[PDB]
Design a protein around this ligand. Structure first.
Ligand SMILES: [Zn+2]
Ligand SMILES: [Zn+2]
Lengths: 238, 52
């Protein structure tokens, strides 16, 4: 039905087989995510390296599943590619072991099919369609005073939503200038943005150089900008 | 303060999407939580074109 999603699920199955785990929760669900989070913590405690790295990687795939489901296939593919590109960089050119080799080779085996599935032009899902029409209708209606914030759950989601806007010229043609806005603290899920960069982005939003901020919810403390005339909550409650 | 800030909540079950929308006074706090606030600046209108 979704060949890209199906490949991801097959891969995650292989990894679970490799480290011999079988969680009650389903791939792509929050309780599955909370379960990986526990396993990973325990593996660091007990010092089980195989279990820790497998959980770490499984989380990257679970993340890709969620991006696939809520934004596009291409963004999910990029999330995985970037992660494996970083692993290759820091570990394959050492403290490299059987689990690292196994995970990396498993992804490389699938990379070109995943890439080509990602490159296939696909129709937007209903979530993104509803998001598009909301932005579009608001921007045409309020024109030069359009000033919006979209809240999303994760850093990778905010970045992906921003890329999608850029990839779609119709947004630009109704005035949209968007930018993601995320925290400074370290996260396994995504790179940080310094407090400095945050301040510059917000400044640009104040001046109107940016008019659509895409932020995580752990930003709302310093986003109380009176001139905002639309807020969109995108999948905060599922 | 001074106007209506349009508020949206886009949620789903599977790929079945539901949108909730309403209005807040422009003086009220910006929040990820889905809140209905009252106007404290006293310059905000009672309704706009968007909420009738
Ligand atoms: Zn007010
Ligand atoms: Zn209104």
């Amino acid at each position: 039905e979704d060949l890209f999603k199906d490949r991801l699920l097959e891969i995650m199955t292989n990894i679970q087989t490799f480290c011999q785990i079988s969680p009650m929760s389903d791939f792509g669900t929050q309780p599955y995510e909370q379960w990986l989070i526990q396993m990973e913590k325990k593996a660091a405690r007990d010092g089980n390296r195989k279990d820790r790295v497998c959980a770490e990687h499984l989380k990257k795939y679970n993340e890709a599943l969620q991006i696939n489901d809520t934004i596009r296939r291409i963004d999910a593919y990029n999330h995985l590619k970037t992660f494996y590109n970083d692993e290759k960089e820091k570990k394959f050119e050492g403290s490299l072991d059987e689990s690292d080799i196994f995970l990396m080779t498993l992804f490389l085996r699938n990379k070109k099919i995943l890439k080509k599935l990602a490159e296939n032009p696909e129709y937007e899902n209903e979530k993104l369609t509803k998001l598009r029409n909301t932005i579009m209708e608001h921007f045409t209606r309020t024109e030069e005073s359009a000033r919006g914030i979209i809240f999303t759950k994760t850093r990778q989601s905010a970045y992906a939503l921003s890329q999608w806007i850029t990839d779609n010229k119709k947004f630009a043609e109704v005035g949209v200038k968007a930018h993601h806005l995320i925290g400074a603290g370290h996260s396994s899920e995504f790179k940080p943005m310094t407090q400095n960069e945050q301040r510059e982005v917000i400044s640009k939003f104040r001046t109107g150089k940016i008019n659509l901020l895409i932020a995580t919810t752990v930003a709302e403390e310093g986003l109380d900008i009176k001139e905002c005339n639309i807020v969109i909550r995108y999948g905060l409650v599922t | 303060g001074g106007f209506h800030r349009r508020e949206y909540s886009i949620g789903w079950v599977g790929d079945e999407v539901k949108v909730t929308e309403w209005c807040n006074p422009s003086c009220s706090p910006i929040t990820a939580a889905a809140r209905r606030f009252e106007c404290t600046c006293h310059q905000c209108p009672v309704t706009c074109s968007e909420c009738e």
